[PDB]
Amino acid sequence: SATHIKFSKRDEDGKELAGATMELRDSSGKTISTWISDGQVKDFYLYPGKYTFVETAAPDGYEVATAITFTVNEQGQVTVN
Amino acid sequence: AHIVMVDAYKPT
Protein backbone atom coordinates (compact mmCIF):
# COMPACT_ATOMS: atom_id res chain seq x y z
CA SER A 1 0.00 0.00 0.00
CA ALA A 2 2.96 2.32 -0.64
CA THR A 3 2.15 5.34 -2.77
CA HIS A 4 4.55 6.58 -5.42
CA ILE A 5 5.59 10.20 -4.86
CA LYS A 6 7.51 12.24 -7.43
CA PHE A 7 9.50 15.17 -6.08
CA SER A 8 10.74 17.94 -8.36
CA LYS A 9 13.05 20.72 -7.22
CA ARG A 10 12.91 23.48 -9.77
CA ASP A 11 13.84 27.02 -10.58
CA GLU A 12 11.30 29.66 -11.63
CA ASP A 13 11.55 28.77 -15.32
CA GLY A 14 10.30 25.35 -14.28
CA LYS A 15 13.53 23.51 -14.96
CA GLU A 16 14.98 20.92 -12.57
CA LEU A 17 17.45 22.56 -10.21
CA ALA A 18 20.63 20.89 -8.96
CA GLY A 19 22.48 21.68 -5.74
CA ALA A 20 19.75 21.88 -3.09
CA THR A 21 20.17 19.90 0.11
CA MET A 22 16.83 18.26 0.90
CA GLU A 23 15.38 16.14 3.69
CA LEU A 24 12.18 14.16 3.78
CA ARG A 25 10.75 13.87 7.28
CA ASP A 26 7.84 11.93 8.73
CA SER A 27 5.39 13.38 11.24
CA SER A 28 7.48 12.20 14.20
CA GLY A 29 10.40 14.29 12.98
CA LYS A 30 12.39 11.34 11.74
CA THR A 31 14.53 12.18 8.74
CA ILE A 32 13.60 9.46 6.23
CA SER A 33 16.14 10.55 3.64
CA THR A 34 18.63 13.32 2.87
CA TRP A 35 19.92 14.07 -0.60
CA ILE A 36 21.25 16.82 -2.79
CA SER A 37 19.13 17.63 -5.85
CA ASP A 38 20.75 16.58 -9.13
CA GLY A 39 18.53 17.85 -11.93
CA GLN A 40 16.01 15.00 -12.09
CA VAL A 41 12.78 13.83 -10.45
CA LYS A 42 13.23 12.09 -7.08
CA ASP A 43 10.98 9.07 -6.46
CA PHE A 44 9.78 7.84 -3.06
CA TYR A 45 7.26 5.19 -2.01
CA LEU A 46 5.37 6.08 1.15
CA TYR A 47 2.76 4.51 3.40
CA PRO A 48 -0.15 6.51 4.88
CA GLY A 49 1.14 9.22 7.15
CA LYS A 50 2.01 12.90 7.16
CA TYR A 51 5.42 13.94 5.81
CA THR A 52 7.47 17.09 5.15
CA PHE A 53 9.97 17.90 2.38
CA VAL A 54 12.47 20.31 3.89
CA GLU A 55 15.11 22.34 2.03
CA THR A 56 18.11 22.62 4.36
CA ALA A 57 20.42 24.42 1.92
CA ALA A 58 19.87 26.22 -1.39
CA PRO A 59 22.43 26.56 -4.17
CA ASP A 60 24.12 29.91 -4.41
CA GLY A 61 21.93 32.50 -6.11
CA TYR A 62 18.80 30.74 -4.85
CA GLU A 63 16.45 31.22 -1.92
CA VAL A 64 15.45 28.49 0.47
CA ALA A 65 11.93 27.32 -0.28
CA THR A 66 9.25 27.00 2.39
CA ALA A 67 8.92 23.39 3.52
CA ILE A 68 6.09 21.37 2.01
CA THR A 69 3.85 19.33 4.29
CA PHE A 70 1.75 16.58 2.73
CA THR A 71 -0.44 13.65 3.66
CA VAL A 72 -0.83 10.26 2.04
CA ASN A 73 -4.14 8.72 3.09
CA GLU A 74 -5.39 5.16 3.52
CA GLN A 75 -6.85 5.21 -0.01
CA GLY A 76 -3.49 5.99 -1.57
CA GLN A 77 -4.31 9.57 -2.53
CA VAL A 78 -2.07 12.52 -1.64
CA THR A 79 -3.00 15.92 -0.28
CA VAL A 80 -1.03 19.07 0.55
CA ASN A 81 -1.50 20.55 4.02
CA ALA B 1 1.73 11.96 -7.04
CA HIS B 2 3.73 15.13 -7.80
CA ILE B 3 5.32 17.42 -5.30
CA VAL B 4 6.98 20.46 -6.84
CA MET B 5 9.22 22.76 -4.82
CA VAL B 6 10.60 25.92 -6.44
CA ASP B 7 13.73 27.73 -5.35
CA ALA B 8 13.17 31.43 -6.15
CA TYR B 9 16.04 33.56 -7.48
CA LYS B 10 17.86 35.93 -5.15
CA PRO B 11 17.69 39.59 -6.24
CA THR B 12 20.68 41.76 -7.24
Q: What is the resolution of this structure in A?
A: 2.0
Q: How was this structure determined?
A: X-ray
Question: With contacts defined as CB-CB under 8 Å, which chain B residues touch A17?
Answer: 7
- 3-class secondary structure, A21: strand
Residue A14: which region, alpha, beta or left (left: phi > 0; alpha: psi -120 to 50)? left
Of B7, B1, B11, nearest in space to A10 by CA: B7
Q: Which residues lie closer than 8 Å to A32 by C-beta, 6 or more apart?
A: A23, A24, A25, A26, A44, A51
Pairwise CA distance, residues A28 & A31, whole Å: 9
Pairwise CA distance, residues A22 & A37, whole Å: 7
> Which residue among B1, B4, B10 places its CB closest to the CB of A10?
B4
CATH number for the A1-81 domain, one of 3.40.50.10540, 3.40.50.2000, 3.40.50.2300, 2.60.40.10?
A: 2.60.40.10
Are A11 and B9 an interchain contact pair (Cβ–Cβ within 8 Å)? yes
Strand partners, B5: A9
Closest-CA residue of B relative to A79 is B1
Question: With contacts defined as CB-CB under 8 Å, which chain A residues touch B10?
Answer: 61-63
CA distance A46 to chain B (A): 11
Domain assignments of chain A as residue spans, ordered by start? 1-81
